[PDB]
Amino acid sequence: KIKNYQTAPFDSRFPNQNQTRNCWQNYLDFHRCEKAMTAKGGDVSVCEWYRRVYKSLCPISWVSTWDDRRAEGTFPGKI
Amino acid sequence: FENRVAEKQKLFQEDNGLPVHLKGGATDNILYRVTMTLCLGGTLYSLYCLGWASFPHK
């Protein structure tokens, strides 16, 4: 259980200069965990990790547009 | 080396009534007989093994 978080650590799944997927994946994963934990009457405190990570890595503007998209239901990712 | 093909053409075209597998001389014959012996001997050997295995040997 980590909240002694400094910043997103090295992730072997995304080992190269291009980190586009790292942001994306963590953004997705979070909203998927959040949905599951909210949809099965549970704790979203498990989904925290992903939010910290995607928050550290994703540009503000990307996060904003993705959220807006999810609101209007045009978010292309399958959450 | 040197081209002695013409010389072998003559040896093999020589009308000695011998089939090609023997037309080459006395050695063709020993090889032939060695081959046929091993084949037949081995075939007999295998038939024997088939027999032994046919019966429960344990």
């Binding site: 239901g73 045009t74 292309p76 | -």
Partner: protein, 84 residues
Amino acid sequence: ASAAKGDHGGTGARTWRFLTFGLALPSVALCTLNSWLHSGHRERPAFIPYHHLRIRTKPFSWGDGNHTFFHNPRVNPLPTGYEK
């Protein structure tokens, strides 16, 4: 699958005529039968304003500049949704 129709799939105008009418053309008829004993109509897709579709960075230089070239109203929605 694989293939093997005996021999003669090469040499002789008669042979290629034979293949043209005995194999090529019949294949076309079969695929035509299939492509018609299957091809009916796909119900027009639900319209959802995705941003990565119906792109418009510059208006088309024809018509009202908002309709693609082979625009089909039954299946192609404008950026605002289906036409009629």
